[PDB]
Symmetry: C4
Subunit: 354 residues, 4 copies
């Protein structure tokens, strides 16, 4: 007999039940925690990818109350430059600011890049995001120990993990948040290339339960296709959500729009695709996503879905949302009924593309 | 661990078992209850949408023994006008009439629109349909209390809900029927935009069980794709069914037919689509449905399927249908076997479009 | 709570396990029982449809050791004529013959058509097939009683049923076989139009268990897409299988081949389609199936699959096949792995069309 | 009631959980056992098919540390010739060699072909692969007995089986490895034609458990679509994997590339297809697969996925991989999330084609 630990679910497998509500969606509060010490005025973080976040995206993210993580596929001096650009930036009331009244920013690092870390810290970065394919490893854990030993009060996010044991090891090493998601990313092939991963909803749930013991927030990273998924991710216990594909088609993301066969697009590619890495064995693809206009407008629709959700559940804030949330498991047939069905769409909605 | 209340099913997940029958389908009775006090000679209600029901559709609906609900996306004086048109309308033996021998009609209202309610009541409307995205809310419940306090004998339908607790709160507030369906509508994106909803078959079953305690009928609204679904909905305990997409392509629905690429259509759109509401965060889309001719002919095929169903089950009437009904859960493979399979359709059937 | 009797499976949901075998497929015996008194040299029956079986198909069926049922969508005098043509027909060693050494034939009848029955009996028909949408009804059961009372030794098949209770009622009325299948037919829309049916594998299993108590064979009718399905149907306990779509494209079936867009076809339609019945509420469609050549060649491939199957299981004959058979339930993913996958077919196989 | 032994899973139904890792993928060891006495420096075997393995493919396979099995669809003298070509062949450090320092090779045989066996043995073949549609049969078992009685120290692989009982019978007869897979092959139609088979992951698991009692390795043959599947197969307990479709499009496989509609391909067909066998009842199809270049490069990507996998699990070698492995069952929705989703691929990856 093979050891099957459980049957794991992801977003399309569950729904939230409506509950008694005394709140309208414009009234709910959506402030949350990025780390033990850093709060967000809204729970969205743009992914640390070279087709998603550099200074322009990071600036808008923080202006809107979230955060951008500057990717690390560039040399130390450039990444420092990108950070300083964000730091040096009534129209944006919910802006997410540091002590100097400057916009907050995150910056990605890898294993054993203490040089990069020194430079980013001196440049005034708010949080360092230590990302790896496998956060549950000696390499990553040694790096956390080295960083916290050298910078005891630097906010450090570490990822990516998918199990409770992984969350424990990272929290015990002293991280300020853990990032969850092995393989759910739109451009990610890890689960297919290696056969390894945990469906995202189950992964978040397992990791939150363990991380809560340390009061360490969980970041749910990857696999968000719609606003409803953000709601579900937050409802199950994640404190924030990290998004790549939904933000890659924006004005502010790196790169320019192009038109192919009468549609507008931008490139979007995984950091583990051959393209991004330049024989290599990739765990990501290079692709394109539809052009969707301003980051502002995209975030507005996403947050509106979250607001709507909390309204349906009766939650006044994210914490209240998490305690009230009840899920129902659905079937393939229920997924179809949930989507648009038996009607051809003639005017596309801003928040639902089929 | 995440709190999963249950695994919920919708229509495509179940079938009715055939049982011993002494009745032919032309002999079964299909009279039912719309509310505590209002009966239907057949269990179909046309949806309160600006692409489905105005006076023409409402008139035909009631003539055929059902009801139409005039939508509320128009000013008070127009909606009053639409109601009066229905009231002022041997060829139609099963017609559904009031005390004056006039056709019955429903008219939709929202939260805190008592002005609209006064006007509709004075115009002689038979039932007011208080619709909201979230019927299980203080807003809706306060409105019910205010309406029943002012008009103790006005038949009031309230919706939409999807849980037993929601049904209890509404029944205790004094409603005459509850309307069930969060997210199953063909043009509805609520479940995707907010992540909230309950698969329709499970939702009806849960709400009926609670509503029965008060002798309050349940209206199953949305997600009907075929005549079989109506049968299933009634069999599980709903007293009537509300239909949008299947009636939107009729002569009688508002709007005109147009031809696109050699097919005939009519527009059909959700009331929560951007189009219908005129930044906004929609929960519906704008679309088109095939043109299907007269309301008469469509209803004939639908009711024929219901009749056939009750025959197979051996039910002499809807009440008997509900007590005899036994379901079987099926699989994806069983759904395929159920549909047409392994043959290409060359002459389309009136009651089955693939 | 809704009364769900069980979770029902159909063919694509199961596989047979291989077992220890001392037999090759050319050595297994495939004789079986059509009814209590009539045996087949092979277990296939062609459906009683006006696009499948008239004299030519029936003749070939019996020559090959099976049976054809002449459809009843024609007047009494014509159907009598078709029967007499079969009766009046070393090249066909396994031929299925009566007392006169004439080919056996079946002929369909409906409720209260005793006139048709007298005429068919006098014409020398071997078995009368009383078919109805709902075999579990007073109409059908009264007809069985009337026929067995008048013709105590006439072999009577009655259908169609899908439950154990239905099988009991028919067996107690004195039928010689029961026919199983509500809604699995390729051209059938009953499950969608009325919401009523039982997935075919579960239906056979339930009915066999009850019918065995009376020593009454079960005929599994409808839903056969491939040779493997025949094997599964027989393995679960059915004594024979009735086939429409797989035989409709043959030389011998009524009608001529035509070519459309470079492919050859024949018409195939349900008896409850509008076309076949000539307002009406159909439970079938009119369609087309690929032209597949001779009945001989089609049956050869089908029987070869059965032979192969019994080989894999180690069965020396159908009875032995039924006692040895063990199933495994599979998943959607297992179904994909089972089919051809990840390769494009360039030369089509005679026994597998994708 | 029908006897359902279990619900069986295949590859797409499971994932491996990540665990704590102190190893990088370039450090894990991938040596394994082909049989009791023959080791591989890497766990891949090319299928014994006339579109996959003759001398050129076999030579490269062994050079890379695996093995090729020369197919038997040719006369004895030719197959002997192919074997001698392999035997007569620092650039290939991991090469898989015999006592003479010559490349190892396998050669396929059928039931009662002792003549072929004598010739292959005298030609110096390293392992004889006795393949049959049904390894669990008197024919196959008698052949094993005859071969081991005549050649007690000749390494004999026998297949194909799918049950624990089949594994027991073969191990007790004295085989050196068993080969597992009834019906999962890309070009295989056995499960559809006969209704018989076991989903590959369940089949391996069941057979390994029994074979381990004898210290007999299990070869998982067929159904491998991606590198992740190899990992999963090894993780569940198989000692090696046999591959057809993934190697059929290589330079080294028999046949030439051709271009059709702007894509490059090679033919790939089952040994039980009509084409390969030349009325016959096939259990395979003739098809085409994309041209993928050198065997070297394909194997590199496959092994890279395995290495990556073991890294994620923390396994230092295959044996350690097997003891650490924990699976999670996923849903259809989880499979979608696992694949690339919601992005159009613009530059294809070498190790992931959609
Ligand atoms: C986010 C992922 C998966 C990512 C990002 C960048 C590069 C990569 C590559 C190099 C393709 N894969 C990669 O680094 N995989 C890996 C697997 C297991 C262990 Br232990 C360590 C590393 C992967
Ligand atoms: C039927 C629905 C969902 C509908 C109909 C019209 C408009 C809308 C819009 C405005 C898009 N959505 C809407 O009113 N949503 C909503 C969600 C939760 C709570 Br609490 C209150 C309202 C929704
Ligand atoms: C095999 C079927 C379903 C069939 C064949 C011919 C005609 C029909 C039609 C007339 C369309 N349907 C039909 O006879 N349906 C039916 C349903 C319940 C009861 Br009780 C009695 C009859 C159905
Ligand atoms: C690998 C398979 C299935 C294969 C390979 C070559 C030929 C065949 C053919 C001849 C089509 N099938 C075949 O030999 N089937 C078979 C089934 C049961 C028993 Br017991 C014995 C044999 C099958
Ligand atoms: O190439 C890669 N392989 C695997 N995961 C990746 C790769 N590149 C980015 N990711 C992850 O995928 C996330 C984005 O997923 P998305 O929001 O679903 O598009 C990022 O935040 C990373 O965690
Ligand atoms: O835009 C909207 N969002 C969500 N539900 C809607 C919207 N508009 C109409 N509905 C519901 O959908 C039902 C029609 O669903 P249908 O019969 O499946 O097409 C209506 O009766 C309403 O209850
Ligand atoms: O129109 C109809 N409605 C429902 N079932 C039908 C109809 N016509 C034929 N059938 C059934 O379908 C069977 C053929 O199914 P097939 O072998 O899957 O194509 C016949 O033997 C009948 O039992
Ligand atoms: O025609 C056949 N019928 C059934 N299985 C076959 C046939 N030919 C080859 N196989 C099996 O399929 C395997 C290849 O499967 P693949 O790796 O999925 O393409 C071979 O190693 C054989 O075990
Ligand atoms: K919907
Ligand atoms: K069907
Ligand atoms: K297959
Ligand atoms: K993915």
């Amino acid at each position: 007999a093979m050891k099957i630990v459980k049957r794991a679910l992801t977003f399309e497998d569950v729904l939230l039940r409506p509950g008694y509500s005394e709140v309208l969606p414009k009234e709910v509060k959506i402030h949350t925690k990025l780390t033990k010490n850093i709060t967000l005025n809204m729970p969205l973080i743009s992914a640390a990818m070279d087709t998603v976040t550099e200074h322009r995206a990071a600036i808008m993210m923080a202006r809107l109350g979230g955060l951008g993580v500057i990717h690390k596929n560039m040399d130390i001096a450039s990444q420092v430059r990108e950070v300083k650009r964000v730091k040096k930036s009534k129209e944006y009331p919910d802006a997410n600011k540091d002590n100097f009244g400057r916009l907050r920013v995150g910056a990605a690092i890898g294993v054993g890049q203490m040089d990069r870390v020194d430079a980013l810290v001196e440049a005034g970065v708010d949080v360092v995001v230590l990302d790896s394919a496998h956060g549950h490893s000696k390499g990553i854990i040694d790096t956390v120990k080295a960083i916290k030993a050298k910078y005891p009060n630097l906010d450090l996010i570490a990822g990516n993990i998918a199990t409770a044991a992984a969350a424990k090891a990272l929290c015990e090493a002293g991280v300020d948040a853990v990032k969850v998601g092995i393989g759910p990313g739109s451009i990610c092939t890890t689960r297919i290339v290696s056969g390894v991963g945990v469906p995202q909803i189950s992964a978040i749930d397992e990791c939150v339960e363990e991380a809560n013991k340390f009061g360490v927030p969980v970041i749910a990273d990857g696999g968000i296709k719609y606003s409803g998924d953000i709601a579900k991710a937050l409802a199950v216990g994640a404190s924030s959500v990290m998004i790549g594909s939904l933000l890659a088609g924006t004005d502010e993301s790196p790169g320019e729009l192009f038109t192919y066969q009468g549609r507008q697009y931008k490139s979007y590619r995984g950091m583990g695709s051959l393209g991004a890495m330049q024989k290599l064995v990739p765990e990501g693809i290079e692709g394109r996503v539809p052009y969707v206009g301003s980051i502002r407008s995209v975030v507005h629709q996403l947050l509106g879905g979250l607001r709507s959700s909390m309204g349906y559940v009766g939650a006044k804030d994210i914490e209240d949302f998490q305690k009230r949330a009840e899920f129902v498991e659905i079937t393939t047939a229920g997924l179809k009924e949930s989507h648009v069905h038996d009607v051809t769409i003639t005017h596309e909605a801003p928040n639902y593309k089929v």
